[PDB]
């Protein structure tokens, strides 16, 4: 048996953890084993594999030389789903939630007060995307441990998160793999052996996210909008239809322009409420993750601005300076796919744009209506708002490319 929080209790959470290890030994498939194996040889570049792998082609993902590894330690995971919460323990860097500086330097003890506050307010009313696999610790680190950054993260995990724990030569690890959005609901300055650490408090939030696996994505979206042209009026359908077969050019552009107010169109501002009552007629039913690989217009940029070279490190640095934290809008009705695999449509877009859809938001699976050529699409309401939370960077061959965490806010 076990707590929900193991606390400060180490020799008790140890224990559990080596009896855990050891029974969970026997669950392991050979391959498993294997991949295991392979992750304590190498767990920094199969963990970072593991946050980035799904931006990449079908082919460039199923012929990586870690995708097996990934796929066995997922699977080794998943086979070991906790019955009740768990409390867990990481440390974590502040940049992670987009605080671009340190809390303090490492031989520093004192995190300010000015510092703390600075924190609580770039942190707070934000979602931020975890993926990824992580040794975690199911105790709060005390003198004896190692304590790399001035921030320890204590995450509830539900129940049915996977756990793994495994018997590293002679230490004992726990490995969990990331995929959901947290929220940091509060933090608190702790004193461990002499200095200072901000102890977030963090929840985990889902959010429907198929990632690489374009075929359950869309199945999830045919079984939600195959019947969605019916719900639709003579005229919504008729709009919705040209839209889709190519009317988002003359559409698209004329809200990009301001048109409405500039040039004014009835026909096609009717067009866009007919388009925009379709989005609102079976809004998406659960909260949904969706990729939007974004051309640098979208961000006020052109394809030779020298701010689009991401290679060059200070031009993450103004990106995220500019954009983080902030609400991005789109005048134009706003294509998605619920894939976050590379397309050749969109191969050269250094942006990629990974939107959480609340529960209830307007939008609608167009890839559900047959021969379409927009590649398991989720159509966003024009007008629509997307908070930045946090922007991250890969590399794609040798070209940098962002991931842009946001939500989509009304």
């Given at each position: 048996e076990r707590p929900e929080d193991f606390l400060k209790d180490k020799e008790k959470a140890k224990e559990w953890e080596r009896k855990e290890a050891e029974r969970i030994e026997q669950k392991l498939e050979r391959s498993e084993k294997e991949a295991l194996e392979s992750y304590k040889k190498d767990s920094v570049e199969i963990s970072?594999?593991?946050?980035?792998?799904?931006?990449?082609?079908?082919?460039?993902?199923?012929?990586?030389?870690?995708?097996?590894?990934?796929?066995?330690?997922?699977?080794?995971?998943?086979?070991?789903?906790?019955?009740?919460?768990?409390?867990?323990?990481?440390?974590?860097?502040?940049?992670?939630?987009?605080?671009?500086?340190?809390?303090?330097?490492?031989?520093?003890?004192?995190?300010?007060?000015?510092?703390?506050?600075?924190?609580?307010?770039?942190?707070?009313?934000?979602?931020?995307?975890?993926?990824?696999?992580?040794?975690?610790?199911?105790?709060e680190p005390g003198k004896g441990d190692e304590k790399p950054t001035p921030l320890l993260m204590h995450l509830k995990l539900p129940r049915n998160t996977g756990m793994?724990?495994?018997?590293?030569?002679?230490?004992?690890?726990?490995?969990?793999?990331?995929?959901?959005?947290?929220?940091?609901?509060?933090?608190?300055?702790?004193?461990?052996?002499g200095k200072h650490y901000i102890k977030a408090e963090?929840?985990?939030?889902?959010?429907?996210?198929?990632?690489?696996?374009?075929?359950?994505?869309?199945?999830?979206?045919?079984?939600?909008?195959?019947?969605?042209?019916?719900?639709?009026?003579?005229?919504?359908?008729?709009?919705?239809?040209?839209?889709?077969?190519?009317?988002?050019?003359?559409?698209?552009?004329?809200?990009?322009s301001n048109g409405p107010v500039n040039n004014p169109n009835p026909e096609l501002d009717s067009k866009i409420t007919n388009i925009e009552n379709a989005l609102k007629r079976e809004p998406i039913?659960?909260?949904?993750?969706?990729?939007?690989?974004?051309?640098?217009?979208?961000?006020?940029?052109?394809?030779?601005?020298?701010?689009?070279?991401?290679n060059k490190l200070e031009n993450i640095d103004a990106f995220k300076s500019k954009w983080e934290g902030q609400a991005l809008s789109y005048p134009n009705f706003i294509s998605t796919s619920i894939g976050s695999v590379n397309m050749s449509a969109f191969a050269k877009r250094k942006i990629v744009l990974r939107i959480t859809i609340p529960?209830?938001?307007?939008?609608?699976?167009?890839?559900?209506?047959?021969?379409?050529?927009?590649?398991?699409?989720?159509l966003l309401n024009h007008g629509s708002k997307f908070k930045i939370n946090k922007i991250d960077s890969y590399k794609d061959g040798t070209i940098t490319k962002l991931i842009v965490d946001a939500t989509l806010i009304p």
């Open positions: 970072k594999y593991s946050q980035t792998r799904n931006y990449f082609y079908d082919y460039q993902i199923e012929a990586n030389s870690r995708e097996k590894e990934y796929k066995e330690l997922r699977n080794a995971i998943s086979k070991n789903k906790i019955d009740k919460p768990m409390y867990v323990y990481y440390f974590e860097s502040p940049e992670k939630f987009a605080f671009n500086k340190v809390i303090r330097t490492e031989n520093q003890n004192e995190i300010s007060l000015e510092k703390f506050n600075e924190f609580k307010e770039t942190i707070q009313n934000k979602l931020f995307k975890q993926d990824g696999f992580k040794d975690i610790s199911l105790y793994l724990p495994y018997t590293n030569t002679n230490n004992v690890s726990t490995l969990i793999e990331q995929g959901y959005s947290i929220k940091i609901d509060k933090i608190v300055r702790i004193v461990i052996d963090a929840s985990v939030v889902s959010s429907l996210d198929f990632k690489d696996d374009v075929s359950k994505g869309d199945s999830w979206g045919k079984a939600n909008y195959n019947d969605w042209s019916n719900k639709l009026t003579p005229n919504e359908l008729a709009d919705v239809n040209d839209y889709m077969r190519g009317g988002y050019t003359a559409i698209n552009n004329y809200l990009i039913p659960t909260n949904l993750t969706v990729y939007r690989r974004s051309g640098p217009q979208e961000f006020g940029l052109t394809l030779t601005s020298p701010e689009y070279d991401f529960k209830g938001s307007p939008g609608a699976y167009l890839s559900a209506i047959p021969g379409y050529a927009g590649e398991y699409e989720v």
